[PDB]
Write a protein that binds this ligand. Structure first.
Ligand code: NI
Length: 168
């Protein structure tokens, strides 16, 4: 099932997620529907909290033909180094992109879809993507990194967009 993605300025985007207590079949259905929603919305990553589920689950897939789907449950940042930034988009901030400071490399520890633990050293797009999604889980958005004026300037935009969007 395709889940509905919340947009700013929805207050539920600012909720802190709780860790997953047990990775079971309800968890695994959330994963499936999250992947479905991400692909439908043409993203390369989705955090559970953008879909009003306030648990620590992230799905990513950067692959061309769904060969390499990635699942981080209860993710934890072990180390980072460097600094970079591309012009990020966010499914919850529709059509708005900004360059954002990130660590260039990142080492994490998480659980997979089966609740088995793994480690992952990432760089490039993957590293930036992990940070972006992990931010979602503590209620941070990429626009939080920008100046009051850019944020202000941004917010105006999106509300109009959706104000078109329901359209009716
Ligand atoms: Ni996002």
């Amino acid at each position: 099932s395709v889940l509905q993605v919340l947009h700013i300025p929805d207050e539920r985007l600012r909720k802190v997620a709780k860790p997953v207590e047990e990775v079971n079949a309800e968890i695994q259905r959330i994963v499936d529907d999250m992947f479905e929603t991400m692909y439908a919305e043409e993203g390369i990553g989705l955090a559970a909290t953008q879909v009003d589920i306030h648990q620590r689950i992230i799905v990513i897939d950067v692959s061309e033909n769904r060969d390499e789907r990635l699942v981080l449950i209860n993710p934890e940042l072990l180390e980072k180094s460097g600094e970079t930034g591309i012009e990020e988009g966010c499914l919850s901030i529709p059509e708005q992109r900004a360059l954002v400071p990130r660590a260039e490399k990142v080492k994490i520890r998480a659980l997979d879809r089966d609740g088995k633990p793994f480690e992952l050293e990432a760089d490039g797009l993957l590293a930036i993507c992990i940070q972006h999604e992990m931010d979602h889980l503590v209620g941070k958005l990429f626009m939080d990194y920008l100046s009051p004026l850019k944020q202000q300037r941004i917010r105006q935009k999106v509300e109009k967009l959706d104000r078109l969007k329901a359209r009716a």
